[PDB]
Amino acid sequence: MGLFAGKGVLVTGGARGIGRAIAQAFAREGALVALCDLRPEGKEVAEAIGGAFFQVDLEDERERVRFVEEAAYALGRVDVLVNNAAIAAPGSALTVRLPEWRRVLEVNLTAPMHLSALAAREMRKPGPGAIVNVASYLGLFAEQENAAYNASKGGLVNLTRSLALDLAPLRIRVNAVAPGFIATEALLELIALSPDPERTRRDMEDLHALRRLGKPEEVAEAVLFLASEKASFITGAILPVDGGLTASF
Amino acid sequence: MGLFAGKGVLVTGGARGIGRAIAQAFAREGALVALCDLRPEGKEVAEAIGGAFFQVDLEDERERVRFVEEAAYALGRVDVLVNNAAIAAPGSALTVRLPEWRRVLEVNLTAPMHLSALAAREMRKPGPGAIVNVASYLGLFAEQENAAYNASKGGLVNLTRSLALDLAPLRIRVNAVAPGFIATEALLELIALSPDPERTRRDMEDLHALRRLGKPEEVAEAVLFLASEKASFITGAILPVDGGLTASF
Amino acid sequence: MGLFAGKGVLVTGGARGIGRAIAQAFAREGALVALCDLRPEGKEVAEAIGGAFFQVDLEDERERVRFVEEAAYALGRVDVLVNNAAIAAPGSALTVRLPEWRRVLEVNLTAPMHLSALAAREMRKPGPGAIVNVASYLGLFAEQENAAYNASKGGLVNLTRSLALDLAPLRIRVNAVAPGFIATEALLELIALSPDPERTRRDMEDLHALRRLGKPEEVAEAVLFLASEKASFITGAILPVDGGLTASF
Amino acid sequence: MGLFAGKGVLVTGGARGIGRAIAQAFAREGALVALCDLRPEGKEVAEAIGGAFFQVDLEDERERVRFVEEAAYALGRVDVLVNNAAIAAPGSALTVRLPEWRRVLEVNLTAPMHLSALAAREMRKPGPGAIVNVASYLGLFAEQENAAYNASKGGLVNLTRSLALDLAPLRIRVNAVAPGFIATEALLELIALSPDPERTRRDMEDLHALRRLGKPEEVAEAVLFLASEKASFITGAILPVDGGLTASF
């Protein structure tokens, strides 16, 4: 019935973008998908693929304990966690507000650590488990006026390595993908509202060796590969999905 | 009938180890596999999988032009090249002989560049192409008494990025895998002939988060993934297949 | 006279180890050094070098605003900040407590961001400024049972790049050092309390190409260099001071 | 007297650019400088700083043995080697000619290995020694139509780590600098001969956080630092001198 047939898969930020594409990809391969999101529209994504939805605020450590226990119950097992949900807070260190900074770290860095520990305790039961963290090229490099995101993704990259060492004894592999510019609704809104939308999109495309935006589907393929038993000797790895963006200037 | 159904796939060093496992993996997914090797036993690997064999010395620029022309003829098309063949010359810069050094660079660095140029001209004809270079953790770091291999693999890593930029216009993706310790015949011979074979193997295992050697099969799975259209937005990437080796100390 | 003659230098964690060595190094080159620490013995380090001491808890955002204002007042200018102070919370993601994790992030990642913003506002006045962050090889890799430190140092590395981009317009350079194992009092306490102290120290030494522990003085030399106008075209750099530790396995 | 007072320093490509700036910097700190170059104007650089000149073609293994023996004779000791001389061959893997590629590897990768081995045998005599390799951001990344330079600099970076491990036992430290765009005569000629010279220079400047070209002098400061006893716990390091170029896109 497919590559993830009867496997329990948790996916954060599953309502839109890469998260939705990942939930869809796992369902297509016969996974029992539990997805969470702040946005209530997440309900319709889970309905559409035959999986479970949970309205969660990942900023809240109690809401995170809740999400994993209820998802494990709903699916009957946990085999894969995908930490995909992230927020940003615009500004340099000069301009960013401390409470905004602290919120971005909680969601982007603390929540993935917490959830990996919770999900790991469930993965012990059956055969092997796997965690995939969705970072960004903006974990390996910086852009202007985005300190909180750069810092949190840097942390997420080294947390991926830490979790790989610590959870190998429990037969759990942990890897990350680092996407380039992906044509999600949010990036299309940003381009659309720029002064010269076509010039903006051309400038973004030109940064990639492949001279085009990524598709959420293309990120999900990498995630499926890294969560799969085909990747049985891959742990601690940070895999760019950026059409050549980080190979040049 | 499979993921590489009717595709022409060239594989260097295909007689044993990772190369054999890669040739086998592609054939299993319905590829027309042409494999080359110095070793004449390569004949029996090609017979066994229903592919073409060519006895080639990659040190020779004429033997490399020959291999690609004959393979393209035999298969009728070229879609994927795997640069897997490599040699080493024991010694630091102090102890290595210049002709030995120059030979290692020719095979490990010049040959992959040459072969990528030859195979690329054939990939233009039909739909899209892909190249996968098999490096080593010893391209991103050094070990003692192995200067030629460290240098050539360093070159191979940055050649992978160069080829990704330069061949994107021809709809060709180029990535590398960086294996950890893989239980090939050669590594098992080395362990077996060490004074305390079990102590040697335990020390090698202990360097990896997964506390075991890799299997050639597990490297091939990464190669298939990176050569496949599932990896359609991955180019310029170096993917470790090292069970956590490069994530820790 | 000297290289930092009449310059105001802020140094966190200045009472012992690398911090003390940095405060001493700057003073030796004629700097007005303001150092903070929780430890009251910091007083004797400042007295000894002719600089200012402040007992500060960097966990507290008000105590951080206080430290920079009072230091700027005491010295009459700010030219250099060194973010050296750091804490750990032992444990994997499985075993670490959330409030401990959050505290390590506040001190190791939030405090350096905050302090860089505060010190930057003072650096505007005279000519150019510089910030140096003291990370660790444990920002670029992981060790077992140290998730909070690994994550926070990963963040510190990418924060260094973010600050370099954001503050370059204000003529402020921002770099980090990534030390190997340094023979500070804290590391000597850890060795001393291990079951076989000499076996522990030999194992640590053997991980470095130089087969010895670093000296706090040797880290301070890197910090002075990176804070100096000799480094006038170096910003965004993470400079290992690890005697070859991260060049091999 | 200065920091390199009475020390013998070998510098390749010393006639112009970074090489000249390095030879000048070492002499200023009281070094006995032997510099080589193809260009006979090298004579006037050596005269000007009170050092030795040798007309050498580094492509020739005999001319390299010659250079080290004669320099060691002229200076009476060898303490420091700087591998700075490098060539390029324009073209992708598609477009570059094999003999051109092989020449670039010989000069950029084989010559530095050879010279490091020769100089190391001289460094045994007195106390400690140091080698500094001048790479480029184009050793850690690629640009279009520059395969031979990208590959050779990739090799130079990993050769630096290899030499650091292999030569640490002989009390020899080995590091590299990776410069950004440096305003040498050659880069200024290239800008000057472009259609819109100011637009060309602005685009180059805009790639660096500091939004300006580097000065040869600023690379030389890094080289002196890394060759100096201030860097006594720095070996195997690749230090970018790129005004933040490799920290963003």
PDB file of N, CA and C in Angstrom, chain A residues 89-96 144-148, chain C residues 162 166:
ATOM      1  N   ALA A  89      10.315  37.166  13.004  1.00  0.00           N
ATOM      2  CA  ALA A  89      10.143  38.504  13.591  1.00  0.00           C
ATOM      3  C   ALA A  89      11.102  39.434  12.854  1.00  0.00           C
ATOM      4  N   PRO A  90      10.576  40.250  11.920  1.00  0.00           N
ATOM      5  CA  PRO A  90      11.406  41.180  11.158  1.00  0.00           C
ATOM      6  C   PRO A  90      12.284  42.050  12.060  1.00  0.00           C
ATOM      7  N   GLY A  91      13.492  42.363  11.584  1.00  0.00           N
ATOM      8  CA  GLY A  91      14.441  43.289  12.235  1.00  0.00           C
ATOM      9  C   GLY A  91      15.803  42.656  12.521  1.00  0.00           C
ATOM     10  N   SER A  92      16.841  43.489  12.426  1.00  0.00           N
ATOM     11  CA  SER A  92      18.214  43.311  12.973  1.00  0.00           C
ATOM     12  C   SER A  92      18.132  43.194  14.494  1.00  0.00           C
ATOM     13  N   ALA A  93      19.267  43.009  15.164  1.00  0.00           N
ATOM     14  CA  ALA A  93      19.336  43.022  16.642  1.00  0.00           C
ATOM     15  C   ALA A  93      18.977  44.433  17.136  1.00  0.00           C
ATOM     16  N   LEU A  94      19.272  45.445  16.321  1.00  0.00           N
ATOM     17  CA  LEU A  94      19.016  46.878  16.634  1.00  0.00           C
ATOM     18  C   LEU A  94      17.512  47.149  16.737  1.00  0.00           C
ATOM     19  N   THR A  95      16.682  46.508  15.913  1.00  0.00           N
ATOM     20  CA  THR A  95      15.276  46.922  15.673  1.00  0.00           C
ATOM     21  C   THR A  95      14.286  45.898  16.230  1.00  0.00           C
ATOM     22  N   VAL A  96      14.700  44.657  16.477  1.00  0.00           N
ATOM     23  CA  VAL A  96      13.786  43.561  16.929  1.00  0.00           C
ATOM     24  C   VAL A  96      13.468  43.783  18.406  1.00  0.00           C
ATOM     25  N   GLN A 144      19.718  40.234   5.721  1.00  0.00           N
ATOM     26  CA  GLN A 144      19.531  41.493   6.482  1.00  0.00           C
ATOM     27  C   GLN A 144      18.170  41.456   7.185  1.00  0.00           C
ATOM     28  N   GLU A 145      18.105  42.024   8.389  1.00  0.00           N
ATOM     29  CA  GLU A 145      16.837  42.382   9.069  1.00  0.00           C
ATOM     30  C   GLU A 145      16.043  41.107   9.357  1.00  0.00           C
ATOM     31  N   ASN A 146      16.729  40.020   9.739  1.00  0.00           N
ATOM     32  CA  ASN A 146      16.039  38.749  10.055  1.00  0.00           C
ATOM     33  C   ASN A 146      16.771  37.958  11.143  1.00  0.00           C
ATOM     34  N   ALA A 147      17.272  38.647  12.173  1.00  0.00           N
ATOM     35  CA  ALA A 147      18.165  38.075  13.215  1.00  0.00           C
ATOM     36  C   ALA A 147      17.512  36.873  13.900  1.00  0.00           C
ATOM     37  N   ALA A 148      16.233  36.934  14.233  1.00  0.00           N
ATOM     38  CA  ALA A 148      15.591  35.902  15.070  1.00  0.00           C
ATOM     39  C   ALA A 148      15.544  34.588  14.283  1.00  0.00           C
TER      40      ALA A 148
ATOM     41  N   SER C 162      24.540  37.143  11.050  1.00  0.00           N
ATOM     42  CA  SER C 162      23.390  38.093  11.014  1.00  0.00           C
ATOM     43  C   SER C 162      23.850  39.497  11.457  1.00  0.00           C
ATOM     44  N   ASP C 166      24.057  43.072   9.425  1.00  0.00           N
ATOM     45  CA  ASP C 166      23.153  44.145   9.912  1.00  0.00           C
ATOM     46  C   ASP C 166      23.985  45.350  10.377  1.00  0.00           C
TER      47      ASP C 166
END
